[PDB]
Amino acid sequence: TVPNTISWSPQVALIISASSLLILLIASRSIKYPQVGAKLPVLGSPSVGTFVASMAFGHVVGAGIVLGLSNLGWL
Amino acid sequence: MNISDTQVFVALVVALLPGLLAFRLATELYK
Amino acid sequence: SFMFLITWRGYWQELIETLVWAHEKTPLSFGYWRDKPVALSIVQARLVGLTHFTVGYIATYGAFLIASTAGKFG
Amino acid sequence: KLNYRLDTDPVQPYKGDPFNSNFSTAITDSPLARAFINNLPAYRKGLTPFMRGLEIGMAHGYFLVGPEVVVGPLRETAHGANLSGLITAIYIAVSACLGISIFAITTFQGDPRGAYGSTSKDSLRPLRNRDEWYQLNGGIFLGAMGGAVFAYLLLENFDALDSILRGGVNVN
Amino acid sequence: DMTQLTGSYAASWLPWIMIPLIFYILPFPVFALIFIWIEKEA
Amino acid sequence: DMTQLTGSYAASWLPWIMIPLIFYILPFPVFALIFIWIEKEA
Amino acid sequence: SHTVKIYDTCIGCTQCVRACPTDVLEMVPWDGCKAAQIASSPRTEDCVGCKRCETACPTDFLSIRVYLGAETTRSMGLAY
Amino acid sequence: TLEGQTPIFGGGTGGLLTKAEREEKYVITWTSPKEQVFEMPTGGSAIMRQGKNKLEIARKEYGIALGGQQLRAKFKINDYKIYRVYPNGETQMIHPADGVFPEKVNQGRPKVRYVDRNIGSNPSPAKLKFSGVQPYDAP
Amino acid sequence: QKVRVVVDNDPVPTSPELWAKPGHFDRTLARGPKTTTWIWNLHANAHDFDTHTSDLEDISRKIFAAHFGHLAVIFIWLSGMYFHGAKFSNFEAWMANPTGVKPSAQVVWSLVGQDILNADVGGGFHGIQITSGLFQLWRAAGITNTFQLYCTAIGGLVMAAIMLFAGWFHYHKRAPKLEWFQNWEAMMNHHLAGLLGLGCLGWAGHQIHVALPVNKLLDAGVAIKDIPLPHEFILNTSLMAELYPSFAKGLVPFFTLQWGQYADFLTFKGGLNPVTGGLWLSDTAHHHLALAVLFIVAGHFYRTNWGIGHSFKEMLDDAKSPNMLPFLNFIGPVGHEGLDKIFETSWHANLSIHLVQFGTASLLVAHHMYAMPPYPYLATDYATALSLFTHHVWIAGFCIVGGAAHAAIFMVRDYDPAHHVNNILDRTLRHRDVIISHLAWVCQFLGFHSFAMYCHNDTMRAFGRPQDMFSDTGIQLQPIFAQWIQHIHTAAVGALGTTAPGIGAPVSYAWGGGMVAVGGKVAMMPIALGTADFLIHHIHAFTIHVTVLVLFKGVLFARGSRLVPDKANLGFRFPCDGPGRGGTCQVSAWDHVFLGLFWMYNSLSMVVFHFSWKMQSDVWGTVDSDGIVTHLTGGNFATSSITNNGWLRDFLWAQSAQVIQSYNSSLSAYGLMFLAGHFIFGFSLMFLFSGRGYWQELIESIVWAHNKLKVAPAIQPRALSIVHGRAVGVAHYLLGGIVTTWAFFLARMSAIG
Ligand code: F6C
Ligand code: CLA
Ligand code: CLA
Ligand code: CLA
Ligand code: CLA
Ligand code: CLA
Ligand code: CLA
Ligand SMILES: CC1=C(/C=C/C(C)=C/C=C/C(C)=C/C=C/C=C(C)/C=C/C=C(C)/C=C/C2=C(C)CCCC2(C)C)C(C)(C)CCC1
Ligand code: SF4
Ligand SMILES: [Ca+2]
């Protein structure tokens, strides 16, 4: 059978936003070389490259999470 | 239906891994 | 024969040296050469390769000559 | 600036000599490998050369019978397969013992060449005397014949031994 | 039949050889190994 | 019959023993003799 | 051992001595050439027969010649 | 005995064999101005010490190649010596034979195996039949 | 800031003056010729750039410019195939009747009777039947008329001119610095996300928007003229909606992560299309789309200019004891530290790795394209299927040998002992006797227990004792591990239970699950493995291991050995070190490549022979109305391939009937080339068996005759050098043998395929 994919709803927006946010806090404190290049609070003051990397990885991880949940009936 | 010939042989080969590690731990504790 | 005629000595001498090391370092191998093993000489290899080439030449055609005639006739 | 880091090297030079063409590995120098190899009959301390040959012969003659019994050309019949296996072990061991004899004849003339010379320090080849080799050979031959015959007797009596190991001899 | 030891389980030949090996073949060599270990001079 | 090696010639038992003797019985002792001959110290 | 001979056509260019991988040759005083020196082979027992000396010799024909002879352990280049 | 401390080397399979203990062995000793990395004659890299060094080698060609192509050409070290060590302990210094490098002419060195003619004047082998004399050895 | 573009301006003037100075790149060759050896040396050192100069920056610029030249050559070759398929082919006729028309794209002129080679290939066309699979590739791309092929031919010529201009521009006008070439992280990011990733994405777009709709109509049976042009599927969205309903809702599901609604054209079926026998194009579209995402993600892995990413140097410096797994700590306390120096300066080391992986890729291409035929009407075109597997097997073998060759070149030329102190490279060299001795032993074990068992079979069969043979009816050698894998992979899709539930059909029918037939011929069916397959696979293991032994001994001993300790000073390519030390012929690392070429040829010849016989015997054939399959050779492989008398009789003698009887027919060219390959093989034997000392002396007498008539040349004739004679021998040997097999394979398949 074709794995189930759900229609767009605020829940998938919450998952993607939360995954992007959590990655942003973790990356600014764990990656080897943050604050490299042009600069953009509670965060570690990440650079532009760190922020775009966090948002891109938030889309990557978030997309995997939403498709994984929707496949299994929310895991 | 019980396990087959291959399953018994696989278990025997797998049991070698804790067998060798048991020897390593025993000799290390003897030190 | 193609092996003895195409490959030449220095390749085999280096390989034999590796096997010499292996024998010396292997336990339970109580044997030991009284004559040091070396690759066949340059001239010797040409003769040995020529011998294999000739013997194969004669044996192959001899078998074909007999079979293709005796099999078809008396 | 230069750090060979030999002190933290898992693989050390063999016996502290970096120029002896050897390494200290799990195969050559681990406590288990040394214990197993040095206590084989070829290396066990204190063994007489005849007793070294006896234990080696019994072990080798015993298993040499097997191959021709199972996949040999007389395998179609039980009795023929067993005889062929015993003969093959006898032929191989007699040939090997002949090789051991002529090895001792040719090696030990004057000061032997190679690893059996007086000044040689080959720890893997400890039988440095001609009389030791002949004592070894006598043990090898008698042990190999005994081991081959022992395997032959067990295979010849396979039907009896199968009933033995299943308790079928306790019916009467 | 019930005149002999048999096994309907897979690889029933295994107890045929393992019982002799563990109980009256290997134990004497094992005792020999332990005896050498406990008698070795310092 | 043609299920075994036989001989209609006289003394057909001769190849029965000569073939083993020359090809896989005597050759190893002969090789041993030659080996001793070519390895003898001067 | 191999035999190494030096003929009177030598010009004392020392090329053969430099090319020898086992130090068989050395340069000795001489008066037959402008360089006032000639090649010598005092240590032919160490000669392996590589003929590197002949390759380096500039004279025509060669002033140094190697004749392969009886083979020994060191003439065969055996480390065992 | 030969003095000097061996270079840092973790071991290898290109070292000495039974021939070293049974027939003969060679040792190359030298002095270097600093600690530095060189290539072993039979593969691998070794670190030569600050003071005087001593390396055991299976063949004489190893010492000539190491001393000539590496010690002199690359590290500008010219005081290296090569010894031949016999199993009974006898040691003789063989390179340089007389303290002067062979490529440099030295007084007192005799002519060895010199033929007083051009190579084209060697006699034909037919004239020396059954005499046991090779054409290049002919007077 | 670290990654930046720096170039020189006009570093080399563009003048043809040096065109009239042959050998200018070499100091020795620049003086001019004195003997004929100068001519050979000029061509031999033409592209050895590191011997033209010692400047790494100048060398790298030559690499970059020359690569553009090779790309232009490939584009001209690609343009030729498209043009010949648009002007001198029966492509349009073949597209109408794929199962009844032989592809043909080469037409010969009629001057000396060679027009007999214009075979009756069907479709009212006369020409040489091609086996390159161009027609099947173009059909899968959606190409339906010769005009589209003509346009691609013009585009290929344009790209060739652009490639040629780029090489001139980046060498004579704007040559990048050495630091530009040393940007590992930037190069990896751009070639992963931008080259592989964007190319997969672009081809996925072409497949989705062009190939899938055109091929869906083609398999439905509608005529070529009734199929709209591919751009109509883009403009008229209603046309795409009818074929795939999901296209009626646009890009909304993609941006909302509702990708499950795209399942009608991004399928995950597996198996083969019943109509054509190739893979489902919708399956390949999802395959390439998934590849594009994976490659683009991989392209953000390395740190270029923004701190984010991984560093090559930090990984290599960290991969050492005790940071490895407990059983992998034997690599020592230095480990991979120092390997980064190799990739900074050694072009040869990188070429060694990349040539090896092109061998790996081409081998995967050969194996994965017959068992999972990706193009329509490719599996049932037996001539094309055999040719494609054989061609890409041979390409891989040459690439692998080249990888070993340039690995040895790196050791002699670029390896620096100071950079490798107790690291893994140094440690590997320090136990090379361990490695070679064990490799030599396993080669002997494999040779005895693979080939000598065939000799055992031949002797038993000749004795009239089939029961004693290694066969399915005698002493069986069942490849149980390979049989088990076939069962696991078949049961994974539902045909250790159902481990790939989403796949409908078996991934490959070669593992089981059923048979596919297209035009009354077998496309793919399960390939049973028995004793004969056990024996032949261990033949491959034996031949590969020996080829490894020859090449890997040369690389490990390139610097020297116990015999010649200073081989590195002698160089990568030298004939010998004299007759001394007993004789040191062929000690150089080059000679190990020379010997390894023969063993690669021997290994790969048996690989393509195994494929040709097994596929004909057990897979390929015709299917009647009742579903009964009669194979091309009728199942000979199981009983005949267990002896090499069977190989000699039932494979070489029997299957050469087509090529040997091809005279006075359209296949007569294959018969001529069959003899041509045999001639070159025998011709090569005098270069391999003889030496230049004989030939130089013979040339002396010939030169005397020319001197007698005052016609001797100033450029003195010389026999080929010792290395050159070996190179000629191996080149003619491999050419003769491969051409012989090429004619043997193609003549038979063009007649019975
Ligand atoms: C004498 C004694 C001795 C000894 C002991 O003591 C030995 C041992 C070893 C070890 C260590 C090893 C493992 C084993 C195996 O697997 O392989 C083999 C097999 C066999 C079978 C071998 C054989 C054994 C013995 C000889 C036995 C004998 C017995 C008989 C029976 C006698 C008979 C007599 C009569 C009279 C005939 C080896 C080896 C090697 N080899 Mg080696 N040996 C020797 C001898 C010889 C000779 C003569 C030659 C020449 C031919 C060689 C050769 C060779 C090569 C190529 C190689 C290889 O590769 C390998 C290796 O290294 O790896 C790694 N090698 N070795
Ligand atoms: C995304 C960027 C990108 C892309 C696509 C490439 C692509 C390529 N590089 Mg490359 N490179 C890049 C960035 C890129 N590079 C960067 C940033 C550096 C500096 C670190 C290098 C440094 C470099 C070196 C040093 C070398 C290459 C080489 C190559 C070629 C390898 C041969 C091959 O696979 O043939 C692929 C075959 C093709 C036909 C691909 C198409 C070729 C053209 C030029 C691509 C044009 C794409 C462009 C976007 C236009 C698209 C139009 C349309 C699709 C929209 C290939 C064309 C090698 C080579 O052969 O040089 C000539 C080589 O030696 N590159
Ligand atoms: C990407 C691929 C690639 C690249 C860039 C190189 C690059 C290089 N290789 Mg290399 N090589 C490769 C693949 C590659 N190789 C492969 C696959 C092999 C295995 C066969 C080799 C084997 C190899 C050897 C053994 C040697 C090199 C050498 C060299 C260097 C000098 C080039 C040279 O001699 O000009 C080539 C000049 C020629 C005259 C060759 C042309 C003659 C060929 C053999 C004719 C082929 C016949 C034809 C295809 C079919 C018949 C034609 C018809 C008319 C009958 C250069 C760095 C040489 C060197 O010194 O390296 C430092 C060297 O000794 N390579
Ligand atoms: C601790 C667990 C345990 C115990 C108590 C037993 C008990 C028994 N097994 Mg057994 N077995 C086990 C685990 C165990 N099994 C496992 C995991 C396997 C799969 C590898 C097997 C495979 C197996 C076979 C194939 C056979 C038996 C048989 C037997 C019986 C005779 C003894 C024998 O031949 O041993 C044989 C033992 C092995 C082949 C391997 C044993 C491996 C275990 C894990 C070792 C345990 C060591 C222990 C924990 C350390 C003790 C410490 C000390 C201080 C006491 C006996 C009832 C025989 C039988 O059925 O007779 C009727 C027989 O033929 N066993
Ligand atoms: C050179 C002559 C010659 C040759 C080639 C053969 C060949 C053969 N004989 Mg034979 N034979 C010969 C003379 C010869 N015979 C003579 C003169 C006699 C009478 C004494 C015999 C009596 C004889 C018997 C009784 C048997 C054979 C058998 C055989 C076959 C197996 C070999 C064997 O068992 O030898 C056995 C050989 C002998 C018992 C004695 C051989 C005496 C000859 C003269 C020795 C010649 C030595 C030679 C000249 C020196 C070679 C030098 C070297 C550099 C090559 C083989 C076809 C066997 C057979 O038929 O199998 C089917 C068999 O059973 N032979
Ligand atoms: C995993 C890689 C992969 C695979 C399996 C395929 C598979 C396929 N492609 Mg495809 N392709 C790929 C990558 C891949 N592609 C890339 C990267 C590009 C360019 C960006 C393309 C461009 C492309 C075009 C333009 C076309 C195809 C087509 C096809 C189909 C025909 C069969 C074929 O090409 O041989 C299958 C190939 C293989 C099995 C092996 C090659 C894959 C690479 C080279 C191996 C790389 C791994 C390497 C050995 C290890 C690297 C070292 C490691 C340390 C990482 C088939 C479905 C054709 C089509 O439409 O079919 C209907 C077609 O026209 N492909
Ligand atoms: C058919 C011809 C032939 C044969 C049999 C061999 C055999 C061998 N080659 Mg070889 N070679 C050949 C042609 C051949 N080569 C050619 C044409 C070339 C040129 C390219 C080379 C180049 C070459 C190289 C470069 C290398 C080899 C290596 C090897 C060895 C591989 C190990 C092996 O298989 O051991 C098993 C031995 C065999 C399979 C030989 C056949 C044995 C028969 C079938 C059984 C005999 C039974 C019994 C012992 C007979 C005794 C009776 C008594 C009366 C004599 C082996 C000795 C490699 C090596 O030495 O690796 C260790 C190696 O490095 N060869
Ligand atoms: C290393 C090891 C191993 C192996 C082992 C082996 C290899 C074994 C073998 C074993 C064997 C192979 C054994 C054998 C034995 C034998 C015996 C025990 C015998 C005895 C004999 C006898 C007792 C005899 C007697 C006699 C005589 C003397 C004379 C008269 C007659 C008679 C018969 C009485 C394993 C893998 C497991 C594990 C790991 C480790
Ligand atoms: S035969 Fe040729 S390759 Fe061999 S050593 Fe003599 S010159 Fe060199
Ligand atoms: Ca009873």
XYZ file of N, CA and C in Angstrom, chain I residues 175-271:
291
model
N 44.361 31.037 -15.659
C 44.766 29.773 -15.065
C 44.694 29.872 -13.551
N 43.874 29.062 -12.884
C 43.761 29.163 -11.425
C 45.052 28.779 -10.718
N 45.246 29.366 -9.539
C 46.408 29.068 -8.716
C 46.343 27.639 -8.183
N 47.444 27.221 -7.555
C 47.480 25.913 -6.909
C 46.485 25.839 -5.758
N 46.338 26.933 -5.005
C 45.419 26.939 -3.871
C 43.979 26.710 -4.311
N 43.627 27.138 -5.525
C 42.280 26.900 -6.032
C 42.000 25.409 -6.175
N 42.972 24.651 -6.688
C 42.788 23.217 -6.875
C 42.754 22.453 -5.558
N 43.292 23.026 -4.484
C 43.399 22.338 -3.205
C 42.176 22.533 -2.317
N 41.070 23.035 -2.868
C 39.843 23.241 -2.100
C 39.031 21.949 -2.119
N 39.407 21.027 -1.228
C 38.708 19.748 -1.146
C 37.245 19.942 -0.771
N 36.990 20.739 0.267
C 35.631 20.889 0.777
C 34.727 21.574 -0.239
N 35.224 22.624 -0.896
C 34.425 23.302 -1.912
C 34.161 22.396 -3.107
N 35.174 21.644 -3.543
C 34.997 20.750 -4.683
C 33.996 19.646 -4.371
N 34.089 19.057 -3.177
C 33.161 17.997 -2.799
C 31.731 18.515 -2.717
N 31.544 19.707 -2.146
C 30.203 20.273 -2.034
C 29.598 20.548 -3.404
N 30.390 21.107 -4.319
C 29.860 21.475 -5.628
C 29.597 20.248 -6.492
N 30.466 19.241 -6.416
C 30.294 18.055 -7.244
C 29.244 17.098 -6.696
N 28.928 17.177 -5.403
C 27.864 16.348 -4.847
C 26.495 16.978 -5.079
N 26.295 18.197 -4.576
C 24.995 18.850 -4.691
C 24.755 19.409 -6.088
N 25.788 19.954 -6.722
C 25.613 20.661 -7.974
C 25.749 19.818 -9.225
N 26.630 18.819 -9.201
C 26.829 17.973 -10.374
C 25.938 16.734 -10.324
N 26.101 15.910 -9.288
C 25.267 14.721 -9.158
C 23.855 15.079 -8.710
N 23.732 15.989 -7.743
C 22.418 16.318 -7.211
C 21.540 17.045 -8.211
N 22.070 18.105 -8.825
C 21.269 18.878 -9.766
C 21.062 18.131 -11.075
N 22.021 17.295 -11.471
C 21.823 16.478 -12.656
C 20.731 15.442 -12.470
N 20.697 14.797 -11.301
C 19.616 13.864 -11.003
C 18.276 14.582 -10.943
N 18.249 15.773 -10.344
C 17.018 16.553 -10.294
C 16.565 16.948 -11.693
N 17.502 17.403 -12.526
C 17.150 17.789 -13.882
C 16.641 16.626 -14.710
N 17.301 15.470 -14.606
C 16.835 14.300 -15.339
C 15.514 13.783 -14.789
N 15.298 13.900 -13.477
C 14.000 13.547 -12.913
C 12.903 14.435 -13.481
N 13.197 15.723 -13.665
C 12.236 16.605 -14.305
C 11.943 16.205 -15.738
N 12.982 15.831 -16.489
C 12.771 15.379 -17.861
C 11.966 14.088 -17.898
N 12.281 13.144 -17.010
C 11.539 11.889 -16.981
C 10.077 12.124 -16.629
N 9.819 12.954 -15.619
C 8.447 13.181 -15.180
C 7.641 13.893 -16.260
N 8.211 14.930 -16.872
C 7.450 15.781 -17.777
C 7.493 15.331 -19.233
N 8.455 14.495 -19.619
C 8.616 14.132 -21.024
C 8.613 12.620 -21.209
N 9.515 11.925 -20.513
C 9.707 10.499 -20.763
C 8.495 9.684 -20.325
N 7.981 9.951 -19.124
C 6.836 9.194 -18.621
C 5.591 9.347 -19.485
N 5.152 10.555 -19.866
C 3.944 10.631 -20.706
C 4.122 10.008 -22.078
N 5.275 10.214 -22.718
C 5.494 9.661 -24.052
C 5.525 8.138 -24.003
N 6.224 7.574 -23.016
C 6.330 6.121 -22.931
C 5.029 5.484 -22.463
N 4.249 6.188 -21.640
C 2.941 5.671 -21.251
C 2.034 5.521 -22.465
N 2.039 6.516 -23.354
C 1.285 6.403 -24.597
C 1.848 5.300 -25.484
N 3.178 5.198 -25.565
C 3.799 4.190 -26.420
C 3.423 2.780 -25.984
N 3.453 2.515 -24.677
C 3.082 1.192 -24.188
C 1.587 0.942 -24.332
N 0.782 2.006 -24.378
C -0.651 1.849 -24.594
C -0.976 1.424 -26.019
N -0.041 1.590 -26.953
C -0.225 1.149 -28.319
C -0.588 2.227 -29.317
N -0.646 3.493 -28.900
C -0.978 4.562 -29.832
C 0.209 4.821 -30.755
N -0.088 5.249 -31.980
C 0.940 5.430 -32.993
C 1.835 6.622 -32.663
N 2.983 6.674 -33.345
C 3.949 7.747 -33.120
C 3.351 9.095 -33.505
N 2.696 9.155 -34.668
C 2.179 10.426 -35.166
C 1.074 10.983 -34.277
N 0.365 10.121 -33.549
C -0.704 10.578 -32.672
C -0.204 11.023 -31.305
N 1.048 10.748 -30.971
C 1.605 11.189 -29.691
C 2.008 12.656 -29.811
N 1.518 13.531 -28.938
C 1.903 14.942 -29.013
C 3.369 15.137 -28.659
N 3.923 16.237 -29.162
C 5.317 16.551 -28.902
C 5.529 16.777 -27.405
N 6.740 16.521 -26.900
C 6.954 16.584 -25.444
C 6.639 17.934 -24.824
N 6.830 19.037 -25.552
C 6.502 20.341 -24.989
C 5.000 20.541 -24.838
N 4.188 19.809 -25.605
C 2.741 19.897 -25.444
C 2.294 19.366 -24.089
N 3.011 18.383 -23.539
C 2.700 17.901 -22.199
C 2.976 18.952 -21.133
N 3.840 19.921 -21.420
C 4.126 20.994 -20.474
C 3.136 22.142 -20.625
N 2.839 22.542 -21.863
C 1.885 23.625 -22.088
C 0.467 23.185 -21.745
N -0.032 22.163 -22.435
C -1.385 21.658 -22.216
C -1.369 20.770 -20.979
N -1.688 21.370 -19.830
C -1.710 20.630 -18.575
C -2.811 19.575 -18.549
N -3.876 19.760 -19.334
C -4.959 18.782 -19.356
C -4.481 17.440 -19.896
N -3.542 17.460 -20.846
C -2.994 16.213 -21.370
C -2.300 15.414 -20.276
N -1.529 16.090 -19.421
C -0.857 15.393 -18.331
C -1.837 14.941 -17.257
N -2.930 15.681 -17.060
C -3.918 15.285 -16.063
C -4.601 13.978 -16.448
N -4.863 13.782 -17.742
C -5.516 12.556 -18.191
C -4.637 11.337 -17.936
N -3.344 11.443 -18.250
C -2.437 10.322 -18.023
C -2.175 10.116 -16.536
N -1.968 11.203 -15.797
C -1.713 11.149 -14.359
C -2.639 12.140 -13.667
N -3.679 11.660 -12.980
C -4.639 12.586 -12.356
C -4.018 13.518 -11.330
N -2.910 13.121 -10.701
C -2.298 13.951 -9.670
C -1.780 15.277 -10.211
N -1.521 15.373 -11.515
C -1.061 16.626 -12.097
C -2.145 17.693 -12.145
N -3.402 17.331 -11.888
C -4.491 18.297 -11.895
C -4.493 19.203 -10.671
N -3.714 18.879 -9.638
C -3.659 19.679 -8.421
C -2.310 20.368 -8.235
N -1.502 20.440 -9.294
C -0.321 21.282 -9.312
C 0.741 20.892 -8.295
N 1.447 21.909 -7.804
C 2.566 21.737 -6.887
C 2.152 21.780 -5.423
N 0.853 21.884 -5.137
C 0.407 22.018 -3.749
C 0.826 20.833 -2.885
N 0.641 19.572 -3.300
C 1.078 18.464 -2.432
C 2.567 18.468 -2.134
N 3.402 18.909 -3.078
C 4.843 18.907 -2.842
C 5.224 19.849 -1.707
N 4.641 21.047 -1.684
C 5.000 22.042 -0.683
C 4.315 21.817 0.658
N 3.279 20.983 0.709
C 2.579 20.681 1.948
C 2.983 19.335 2.535
N 4.008 18.691 1.975
C 4.453 17.365 2.407
C 3.297 16.367 2.401
N 2.537 16.391 1.309
C 1.475 15.425 1.064
C 1.870 14.594 -0.149
N 3.130 14.151 -0.166
C 3.713 13.530 -1.349
C 3.014 12.237 -1.745
N 2.234 11.638 -0.843
C 1.545 10.399 -1.160
C 0.555 10.518 -2.299
N 0.099 11.732 -2.601
C -0.802 11.946 -3.724
C -0.082 11.946 -5.065
N 1.248 11.956 -5.064
C 2.047 11.868 -6.278
C 2.358 10.430 -6.671
N 1.794 9.450 -5.963
C 2.140 8.048 -6.164
C 1.736 7.515 -7.533
N 0.900 8.237 -8.281
C 0.465 7.735 -9.581
C 1.568 7.832 -10.629
N 2.491 8.787 -10.490
C 3.615 8.899 -11.408
C 4.971 8.752 -10.734
N 5.034 8.788 -9.407
C 6.235 8.430 -8.660
C 5.938 7.096 -7.984
N 6.155 6.016 -8.723
C 5.773 4.696 -8.256
C 6.935 4.019 -7.540
N 6.612 2.935 -6.844
C 7.587 2.163 -6.090
C 7.316 0.680 -6.326
N 7.065 0.328 -7.590
C 6.554 -0.997 -7.930
C 7.649 -2.054 -7.873
N 8.756 -1.817 -8.567
C 9.720 -2.863 -8.814
C 9.312 -3.714 -10.003
N 10.100 -4.760 -10.241
C 9.809 -5.641 -11.355
C 10.068 -4.975 -12.696
